[PDB]
Amino acid sequence: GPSRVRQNFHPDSEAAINRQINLELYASYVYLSMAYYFSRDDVALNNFSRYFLHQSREETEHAEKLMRLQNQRGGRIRLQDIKKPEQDDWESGLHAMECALLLEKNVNQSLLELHALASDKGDPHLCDFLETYYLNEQVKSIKELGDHVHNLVKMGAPDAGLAEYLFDTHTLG
Amino acid sequence: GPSRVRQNFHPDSEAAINRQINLELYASYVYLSMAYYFSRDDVALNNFSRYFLHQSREETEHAEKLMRLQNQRGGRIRLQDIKKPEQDDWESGLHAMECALLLEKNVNQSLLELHALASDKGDPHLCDFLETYYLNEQVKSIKELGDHVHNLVKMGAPDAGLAEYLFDTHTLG
Amino acid sequence: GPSRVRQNFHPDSEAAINRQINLELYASYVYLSMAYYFSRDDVALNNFSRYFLHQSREETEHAEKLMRLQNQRGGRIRLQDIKKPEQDDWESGLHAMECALLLEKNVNQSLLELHALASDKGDPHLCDFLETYYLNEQVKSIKELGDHVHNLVKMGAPDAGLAEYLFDTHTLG
Amino acid sequence: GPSRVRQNFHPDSEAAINRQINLELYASYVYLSMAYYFSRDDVALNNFSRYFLHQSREETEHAEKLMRLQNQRGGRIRLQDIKKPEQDDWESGLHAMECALLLEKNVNQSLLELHALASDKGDPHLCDFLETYYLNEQVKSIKELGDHVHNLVKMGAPDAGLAEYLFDTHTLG
Amino acid sequence: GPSRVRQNFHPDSEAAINRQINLELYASYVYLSMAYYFSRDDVALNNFSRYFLHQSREETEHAEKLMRLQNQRGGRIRLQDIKKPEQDDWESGLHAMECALLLEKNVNQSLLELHALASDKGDPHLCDFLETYYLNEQVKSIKELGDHVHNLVKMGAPDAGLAEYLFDTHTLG
Amino acid sequence: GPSRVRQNFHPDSEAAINRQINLELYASYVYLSMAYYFSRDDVALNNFSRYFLHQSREETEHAEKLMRLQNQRGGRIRLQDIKKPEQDDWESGLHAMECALLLEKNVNQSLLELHALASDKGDPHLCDFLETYYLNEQVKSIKELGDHVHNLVKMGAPDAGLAEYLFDTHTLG
Ligand SMILES: [Cl-]
Ligand SMILES: [Cl-]
Ligand SMILES: [Cl-]
Ligand SMILES: [Cl-]
C-alpha cells in the first residue's frame, strides 16, 4: 500500500520473517514425527513421546508469534510448503535427541542472522522482539538438549538395555 | 516385521491412513493461513481470526488421532510435505467461509473413500474408528459452515459495509 | 438445489428418514394415549401413566433427532398427518404393555430397513447414526417391555385383582 | 356409565374438549415444523428455531392439561389424527411469525366458543378452567407475536438483508 | 418360543455368542493363573501380579456383557466347561506378557469372525455391539502388551537380573 | 525345592487346597449361571439376579484367598478345568435357592474334610485359616439360604403368581 501501520520496516526484514515462520513450522513437524516414533509398539518410550510432542507445540507457538509480528508491523505473511522431516525412523532416544540439538542450533543460527539483518536495517523493535522471545529460549533449549545427550551417552545409550528406559522414567518422567 | 501387534490390517489401509494424515495437516495449515488473514490491519475481524485458529487446532488433533491409530494397528507413519494453501489473501470473511466449506467437503470425500476401502478389506475396527471420530464431526462442520455462508450471503457480504462486522460481533463473538 | 451441504446423501435415504420421522411421532402419540388411559378414574394406575408419558416424550426426542439429521445432511423435512392410535381404551396394564412391545418391534423393523437402505447406498454416516442412537435403544426398550409383560402375566394380570396394582406400586413406582 | 365422578358435565362440553385437544396438538405440530425450518442450512436462524420449539412444547402442555381435565371430570378422551401443517417451507422469519399470530387467533376463537358453550351449559368449573389457564395465556401470546411482527415489518423483513439476522440475535437471543 | 423379544437374531449368531462367552471366561482364567504365578515366593513381582489380576477381572466383565447381550436379544445362554490354562508355571514376566499378547490376538480373531458372521446375517445391532465394546478395547490391549514385550526384551529379560524388577517397579507400579 | 518358605505344610494339605480352589471356582460359576437366568426376558426377577451375582463374586474371593494361602505356605497352585453347572435353566426362584443351599452344604462338607486333614497333619495355621475365613461364613450362608427357601415355600412358590415377585421386591430388594 504500504500498510497504514507500516513504519521503519524494511522489505528484507519482512521476507526474512516469512522464511523464519517456515523454519519454525518445519521444526514443529520434525518434533511431531519424533513424538510418534516413540509411541511405536517397538519403541514404546512414552515420556520421550510426550517430551517431543511438547517441543512440537512450542515450535508452533514460535511460528505464530512471528506471524503476529508480521501483522503488527504491516508486513504480509507468505506461507510456503512445510518440508517433511529427514527421517520417519529416528533410530533411538539418543539419536532423536542429537538430531533435535542440531535442529535447534540450526534454528538459532537463522535467528542470529535475522537479528543481524534487523540491526543492519536499524530496526530496534525487531531486534528487541528476537531478544525478548527467541534468543534466550533457544539458548535454554540447546542447553537442555545438550544435558540430555550427555546423560544418555554416559548411561550407554543406545545399546545398553536399561539406559533409554531409565532415562525415560526418571529424567523425562 | 510384521509388527508383533499387527492383525487384520491391510497395507492399502496403512497407506490410505498416511494419505489422510497429510490431508488433515494440510487442512490445519489452510485454517492457520485464514486465521492470520483476519488479523491483518486492513481486515481486522478478530472473531473470524479466532474461529479459524480454533478450526486449525482441531485439524491437528484429527491428524494426531490418525497417527495414534497407525501406531496402535502396527502400521508405520510416513510423513510427506505439507503443501502451502492455495491463497495467502483470502479476500473476505464470506470467501474464507466458502473455501473452508469446500475444503471440508473434500476432506469428507477422502474419509468416505477411506471407509469404503476399510469395508472392502473387512476391517471393522478401522470402519468403526472413522464412524466414531470422523464422519459425524465432518457432517457437523459442513453444516456449521453452510449456516455461516448462508447468513453472510443474506446479510450482503462482502460488499455491504456492516455485514462481516456484525457477523463477527454476534455469531462468531 | 442441491443444498450446499449435501454430500453422499441419496434421495431414497432422505425419503426414508421422513417416513421414520412420522413413525416416531406416531409412537409418541400411542404412548400419550396410553398415559391418559391409566389416569382415568376407573383405571387409576398413576405409575403406569407416568411410565407411558415418559415413553411418549422419548419418542418425540427420537423424532426430533431425525429431523436434525435431515437438516444436517441437507435433506428437506416433509411432515405428514400423525395417525390416531388404534385404541382409546387400552383395556388393562397388561394389554397396554403388550401393544407397546408390538409397537416397539414394528419401529425396530422399520429402523433395520432404514439401516439396510443406508448400507445399500454406501452411507456410513447414516448407518452410524442409526447404530449409535437408535438400534441399541430399541433393543433395550423391547427387553424392558418383554420383562414387564412376563411379570404381569405370571402375577395373573389382568384378572387377578392385586396384580396390576402391585406391579404399579413396586416395579413402576 | 356414567363415570362415578361425573357431575354437571354436559356431553357437548366433553366433545368440545376433545376437539380442543386435537387443535392444541395441531398447534404443537405447526410450531415443530417452524422450529426445524429455521435450522435449515439455507435459513440458519437458531434463535427463531428455539423460539418456535419452545412454543411447540407449550402447546403440548396445553393439550395435556385438557386431557387431564377430561379425566378429572369423568369424560372420555377421544383422539383424532393430527393434521400436517399447511407448509413445510415457511418462507421467512416474518412469514412464520404472521402464520403463528393467525394460528393463535384461530385457537383463541375456538377457546372463546368453548367458554360460551360451558356458560350455556351452566358449567362454572369449565368456565373457570378456561379463564385461569387458557384465555389470558392466549392474549399474552397474541400480543407477543403482534410485537414481533411489527418489529420485523419496520426493520424491513424479509428482504432487508440485516433485519431477520438482527432480530434473531437481539430480540430472540 | 421364540422369545417374545427376539427379532433379527440368527441362531448362528446366538451360538457364536455362547462360544465367545466361553473364550472370555477362559481368558479370565489364564490371567488369574498368571496373577498368582507372580506372587509366588520365588517370583515375587507384585506389580506383575496386580496387572494380570486386573486383566482377569476385565475379561470377566467382557464375558458378562455378552451374557447380558444374549438375554437382551432373547437368546439362551449355554455355558460350557472353562478349560484350565496351558501352564501353571509362566516362567518369567516376559514369557507371561508374550503369552498374554498371543491370547489377546486369538480372542481378537474370534471377535472379528463374530463380526463377519453378524454382517453376513444382516445384524447391525450385533455389529455395533462388537465395534462399540470389543474391537477397539482389543486393539488397545494388544498395543499395550506389545509395548510391554518390547521394553522387557530391550531391557534384557528374562536373564538380566535387574530387568523384570525395574519394569515391575516403574512401568507396572 | 522345597520352597524356602515351606514349613509344617504337608503335600496332602497342598493337594486338598488345590481341590478346594477348583470347588470355589465351580461355585462361582454356578451362581453366575443363576444370576443370568433371572435376567431372562421370561423370568425378569432383577433382585434374584443381583443376589446370585453377588454370591458369584464372593465365591471368586474365597477361591483367591485359598490361592494366596497356597503361595504364603510355599505350595504350588495347580488349576483344573471349571466344570459347567448342572443346569442353564434354573426353573424358578425357589428351585435356584434350593440348588444353592445344596451347593453350599456340599462346599461345607469339603471344607470340614479339609479341616480334618489339617488337624490330622498337625497344621494349626491351616486349621485357623479355615475356621477364621471359611467355616463361619459357610454356616451364615447356609442359614440365609434356608431362610429364603422357607419363605418362598410358605408364600406358595413357584406356582403362586405373586410369591417370587413379592419376595424379589421385599426380601431381595
Ligand atoms: Cl516502512
Ligand atoms: Cl539431562
Ligand atoms: Cl558427553
Ligand atoms: Cl495384518
Ligand SMILES: [Cl-]
Ligand atoms: Cl450461522
Ligand SMILES: [Cl-]
Ligand atoms: Cl444462501
Ligand SMILES: [Cl-]
Ligand atoms: Cl448427495
Ligand SMILES: [Cl-]
Ligand atoms: Cl419387569
Ligand SMILES: [Cl-]
Ligand atoms: Cl411369560
Ligand SMILES: [Cl-]
Ligand atoms: Cl406388597
Ligand SMILES: [Cl-]
Ligand atoms: Cl353429568
Ligand SMILES: [Cl-]
Ligand atoms: Cl418484539
Ligand SMILES: [Cl-]
Ligand atoms: Cl406494523
Ligand SMILES: [Cl-]
Ligand atoms: Cl447490532
Ligand SMILES: [Cl-]
Ligand atoms: Cl429372530
Ligand SMILES: [Cl-]
Ligand atoms: Cl511398556
Ligand SMILES: [Cl-]
Ligand atoms: Cl522388540
Ligand SMILES: [Cl-]
Ligand atoms: Cl513342610
Ligand SMILES: [Cl-]
Ligand atoms: Cl428370608
Ligand SMILES: [Cl-]
Ligand atoms: Cl419350610
